[PDB]
């Protein structure tokens, strides 16, 4: 059938000047002579929003009542009827579309009053940072809804490092590089415009953007101290040598900023310890060992600075680790007298051919440690158990009082020890102790003698144990060599040697007669030496009844 | 079916921005996937005026091409079609009316540059004088065509005595009464306006109307204040006596203004005739009968004045006829001698016993008409055929010259007529004639005599007719009495009276022989008189030849 021409009406205006906007009518009223009542139905009449359209039952004319708004109603598809007096259709109901024409009656508005994004420092060009957005409620795919995003102002404005795509709202990084040390945070006011995106004096909606620039370790540390010299006193420990103040441009607090240290050379002795003070970013070096001013050790050392986190690839190999030298000066302190060595060893001999009672054999001179010169003092002897030595009270010269005896009970590991003290003149009177190590030469002045030359065994005895004693130390005692001699003749076969050891021997009589024998030995040193005295063993073999010692009278 | 809502377009305007003004379409194209072509027909496309609308065969859109003028085309009733490729209908053709909206783009204009109308004087209020008209070609029954008639300027502007209905254009009279004697014609300029009848500085078309106030006789005539005496002469006729001048306020020339006259008293004799002069409005009185100064010296009379037309009902019962005095005196004229009567009667007799030859028997005295006295004149006889009279030239005395005879052939009806003339002395000779009628007494002096005493009849005749003659007038002639007398004896018995007429008689003789006879009569008068002479009839009976005359010889004198 025929399509009824649709009606066009503009939004947001009074349309009373266009009424009636439409009129339906049947030719069955005049030609066929029937009273027909017209009525419409549809959105705006029988459906919401109500009270938009009204109609005359008799004429069939249409009427606009209110102002249309296409943002709420894009079109009205209402239908007209022609009814008889009863209420039935005399004509097939027609559809009449009413199109509402768009007008640009609402501005683009941002989804947020404030946008926030972040981008890393030294980012490549055209790196997407973030994206802003807005919406326009007007007719889609028309200039009334085409948004154009623009940058109003910027901080710190110059230079420009952000490009705002006006069509997409995307923000990119430009070809100018970002440097956080130049500008950490960018705050930016944007704008959204309607139509053709033409900048006019019209006040349009605007939001703000806040971009935070992230940090990278692209700045090498630098020492700020003018004078770099350490300072410690003598005989001190756990003291502050120096504080190495270092500057770093990167983000304060971060591992990209935190100073970090390593000894290059000079601390092989382990005299220093270094650690970074994270609050002042100072390298704290301290003494972990006492130093003697007089020994005059050079404690100078060198150190290398870097960041706790590695350097950015952007700056690597542009960095050469150059060791930073640090001289350290030491303070002298009045210490008073001392000995050039706490212990001294003087070597003496047991023989008279070199050692003699009353010969000088050394001194224990006390020096003033500060000036290193000999100081006037009063020396005194100490703990001389067997009175081997004499100490002069003034000159400190030491001389023997006896001939040393290596075999003495007071000698241990071949040494005879003696303490001595020295006292200074004037105040404050200081007392220092010394030690002398008297190493006595062991000479072979002892020969192997029997400890039990006379003894008496049982008849059931299995063997006899002969044992010797040479008080001499190695090698002047060592293993003995035993030798039983044939005196009287035949006896050498009567008394055999079964087993021998280093200082003893086992002896077995073959025939096993019961009586006393005089058995001479020649027991010789490891050097071959032997006693002038004859080593004789008087052994009496007795008849032992079990339990008892020896038989009686019978 | 559904009637398509018509589309409206304003005339006298460019409609390009409104195109396409309309569009038809079928849903059979989209649903059925068929190629359809649309087309329109009607006034503006296929009928004149042409090329006003054009249409797109494919879309079905309509367009207007030129500027419209609804005064030429009020609307366009065209019809749309939907056709397939073959050329047949896929939809019922719909009617699509295109209405043209009016604009007030032409002004009201009068049917004529000038109107003329008429209204009678002192007409009642709201009397329709006339009607003016104007036309507006714009849409009927709209303010664009509602005309408003108004009076621009009137002369005399004041007072307002005309009301012009702005809606109808009709002109009426107001309660202020019109007086044509004050103002005869109103010339009047009117105007016609468009819209709601609002008077603006806009130049609108204007016309002029001319109104004539027609006259009515509502003003009574008035005569001058002088006495109007007149004077005519004696023996004059058809002469102007006087001119009665009369004034009248009504329309000059009209019968409401024309003086009119009726005689009140003094013209019973029919001596005067009056007729009004239409140019001067004067009453022209003229003498239509001669007057005698000796008999009448004054001819005074009266007339009353009115109008030729009747007075208007408004002014009637206010008019009171006042007779106008007209003294007119007659002037004497020398008329000279005259007779106190043109005719005289004189009685005379035929007998000598009273009338005598030479006796005075009357006079014909001439009098001087002016003085009434007897005047000296010379009198003379006239037409006296038989000389019966002598008239004295000096004294006018009349006397016989002969004895009058009643039987005279010159006498007629017993009267004898004779004229007389009198001539005056001094200059000029006036001559007057008189008449004297002389009546004569008839006396019995004639006797009945026979006219033919000698006769000759035939023997075939059975009677003979004898006749007498008495020349006297009645009664002295009258009937006769005849008597045949016995002389000689015997005659009386043979000649017998058969029958007698008044003046004659016939006789029959018994014997009737052939010969002459002597028959004596005594014929007596009606008075008894008879002739002194013997009255004898000599009758000769002759043979006759049964035809006529006497047959034989001597009875003829000669032949
Ligand atoms: C034959 O005789 C020697 C000599 O000793 C005598 O007889 C022994 C049985 C012991 O009673 C001795 O006290 C006595 O002098 C035997 O002695 C051996 O040597 C010494 C003691 O003589 C022992 O040496 C050791 O010393 C270390 C520290 O220096 C200790 O920790 C040990 O406890 C021990 O004292 C050694 O033990 C001892 N030998 C033994 C007991 O077998 C010797 O052994 C005996 N036989 C032979 C074949 O000569
Ligand atoms: C529907 O809308 C139509 C169009 O606006 C309205 O119809 C028209 O209404 C006006 C206003 O009453 C009428 O004109 C008026 O005339 C009066 C006096 O005649 C005058 O005082 C006003 O200033 C105005 O000029 C007009 O005749 C009428 N019809 C048409 C065809 O225009 C109507 O009021 C609306 N309502 C309904 C119920 O349809
Ligand atoms: C920029 O703003 C736009 C517009 O707001 C965001 O786009 C989003 O578009 C979605 C479509 O997915 C819309 O929400 C959706 O509605 C449809 C039907 O109307 C529904 O089917 C989906 O389930 C969803 O609800 C919406 O218009 C819109 N979102 C908002 C919050 O408005 C876009 O995400 C924004 N950009 C950024 C970076 O936030
Ligand atoms: C404007 O219309 C008027 C009135 O309708 C016409 O003029 C007047 O018309 C009347 C009616 O005819 C005239 O009266 C008489 O008309 C009859 C027709 O039956 C005619 O036979 C008579 O002789 C007489 O004319 C009237 O006189 C006439 N006059 C005037 C001054 O209007 C006319 O159509 C238009 N205007 C004019 C001014 O004519
Ligand atoms: C019918 O009316 C339309 C206007 O609605 C005319 O169309 C335009 O004509 C002008 C001049 O040629 C141009 O703008 C375009 O060619 C047409 N369309 C548009 C959208 O502008 C059309 O000319 C009219 N009459 C015809 C076609 O005969
Ligand atoms: C003036 O008007 C009078 C009255 O209208 C006229 O009078 C009549 O004249 C006729 C004709 O002879 C007589 O029969 C009537 O008797 C008259 N009537 C009256 C009332 O007098 C008169 O003729 C007019 N006179 C003139 C000269 O115009
Ligand atoms: C005698 O003759 C005369 C004339 O010839 C006649 O007289 C007649 O008288 C009558 C009166 O009765 C008159 O009319 C005339 O005088 C005569 N007759 C006429 C005119 O016809 C008459 O005929 C004779 N008389 C008689 C017969 O008695
Ligand atoms: C920083 O300290 C690290 C351990 O945290 C240690 O290896 C060195 O002293 C410094 N730097 C590097 C790279 O090792
Ligand atoms: C000194 O002697 C004892 C016994 O001879 C021995 O065990 C010790 O090892 C020696 N001292 C040292 C340091 O060896
Ligand atoms: C005579 O008088 C008579 C009678 O009236 C008349 O008939 C006749 O005409 C008159 N004739 C003459 C001449 O007088
Ligand atoms: C150290 O030795 C003695 C005691 O140990 C003191 O008396 C002396 O003066 C020195 O200070
Ligand atoms: C060394 O020796 C004695 C102890 O034997 C100390 O008391 C003295 O002061 C010195 O330091
Ligand atoms: C020798 O040894 C003593 C302790 O036995 C020390 O105190 C002294 O200083 C010396 O070195
Ligand atoms: C009238 O009559 C005669 C004519 O007969 C005139 O001549 C005479 O003069 C008188 O006037
Ligand atoms: C009367 O008679 C004669 C003629 O009859 C006139 O001519 C004369 O004037 C007189 O008046
Ligand atoms: C007598 O008769 C004559 C005519 O017969 C008149 O004219 C004359 O005036 C007189 O009256
Ligand atoms: Ca809107
Ligand atoms: Ca909108
Ligand atoms: Ca918009
Ligand atoms: Ca940087
Ligand atoms: Ca950085
Ligand atoms: Ca760093
Ligand atoms: Ca020191
Ligand atoms: Ca020191
Ligand atoms: Ca020894
Ligand atoms: Ca020794
Ligand atoms: Ca030894
Ligand atoms: Ca026009
Ligand atoms: Ca018009
Ligand atoms: Ca008047
Ligand atoms: Ca008048
Ligand atoms: Ca008059
Ligand atoms: Ca006279
Ligand atoms: Ca006179
Ligand atoms: Ca006579
Ligand atoms: Ca006589
Ligand atoms: Ca007689």
Coordinates of N, CA, C and O in Angstrom, one line a residue, chain A residues 1-3 23-28 80-82 91-92 94, chain B residues 1-3 5 23-28 81-82 91-92 94:
Chain A
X1 N 0.8 -1.2 0.0 CA 0.0 0.0 0.0 C 0.9 1.3 0.0 O 2.1 1.2 0.0
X2 N 0.2 2.4 0.0 CA 0.9 3.7 0.0 C 1.6 3.9 1.4 O 1.0 3.6 2.4
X3 N 2.8 4.4 1.4 CA 3.5 4.9 2.6 C 3.2 6.3 2.9 O 3.5 7.2 2.1
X23 N -2.6 15.1 9.5 CA -4.1 14.9 9.5 C -4.5 13.7 8.7 O -4.1 13.6 7.5
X24 N -5.2 12.8 9.3 CA -5.6 11.6 8.6 C -7.1 11.8 8.3 O -7.8 12.6 9.0
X25 N -7.6 11.1 7.3 CA -9.0 11.2 6.9 C -9.5 10.2 5.9 O -8.7 9.8 5.0
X26 N -10.7 9.7 6.1 CA -11.2 8.7 5.2 C -12.3 9.3 4.3 O -13.0 10.2 4.8
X27 N -12.4 8.9 3.1 CA -13.4 9.5 2.1 C -14.8 8.7 2.3 O -15.7 8.9 1.6
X28 N -14.8 7.8 3.3 CA -16.0 7.1 3.6 C -17.0 7.9 4.4 O -18.2 7.5 4.6
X80 N -2.6 5.8 13.1 CA -3.9 6.5 13.1 C -5.0 5.5 12.7 O -4.8 4.5 11.9
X81 N -6.2 5.7 13.3 CA -7.3 4.8 13.0 C -8.5 5.6 12.5 O -8.6 6.8 12.8
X82 N -9.4 4.9 11.8 CA -10.7 5.5 11.4 C -11.8 4.5 11.8 O -11.8 3.4 11.3
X91 N -11.2 1.6 8.0 CA -9.9 1.7 7.2 C -8.8 0.9 7.9 O -8.8 0.9 9.2
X92 N -7.9 0.3 7.2 CA -6.7 -0.3 7.8 C -5.8 0.7 8.4 O -5.5 1.7 7.7
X94 N -3.1 3.2 9.5 CA -1.9 3.6 8.9 C -0.8 3.9 9.9 O -1.1 4.3 11.0
Chain B
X1 N -11.1 5.1 0.9 CA -9.7 5.0 1.4 C -9.2 6.2 2.2 O -10.0 7.1 2.4
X2 N -8.0 6.2 2.6 CA -7.4 7.3 3.3 C -7.2 8.5 2.3 O -6.7 8.3 1.2
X3 N -7.6 9.7 2.7 CA -7.4 10.9 1.9 C -6.1 11.4 2.3 O -5.8 11.8 3.5
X5 N -3.2 13.9 3.2 CA -3.2 15.2 3.7 C -2.7 16.2 2.6 O -1.6 15.9 2.1
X23 N 5.9 13.9 -1.5 CA 6.4 12.6 -2.0 C 5.5 11.5 -1.8 O 4.8 11.4 -0.7
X24 N 5.3 10.7 -2.8 CA 4.4 9.5 -2.7 C 5.4 8.3 -2.7 O 6.5 8.4 -3.2
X25 N 4.9 7.1 -2.3 CA 5.8 6.0 -2.2 C 4.9 4.7 -1.9 O 3.9 4.8 -1.2
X26 N 5.4 3.6 -2.5 CA 4.7 2.3 -2.2 C 5.7 1.4 -1.4 O 6.9 1.4 -1.6
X27 N 5.1 0.5 -0.6 CA 5.9 -0.4 0.2 C 6.1 -1.7 -0.6 O 6.7 -2.7 -0.1
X28 N 5.5 -1.8 -1.8 CA 5.6 -3.0 -2.6 C 7.0 -3.1 -3.3 O 7.3 -4.2 -3.7
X81 N 0.3 8.2 -9.3 CA 0.2 6.8 -9.7 C 1.5 6.0 -9.3 O 2.5 6.6 -9.1
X82 N 1.3 4.7 -9.1 CA 2.5 3.8 -8.9 C 2.4 2.7 -10.0 O 1.4 1.9 -10.0
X91 N -0.7 0.2 -7.4 CA -1.5 0.8 -6.3 C -2.7 1.6 -6.9 O -2.6 2.0 -8.1
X92 N -3.7 1.8 -6.1 CA -4.8 2.7 -6.6 C -4.3 4.1 -6.7 O -3.6 4.5 -5.7
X94 N -3.8 7.8 -6.1 CA -4.3 8.7 -5.0 C -4.5 10.1 -5.5 O -3.7 10.6 -6.4

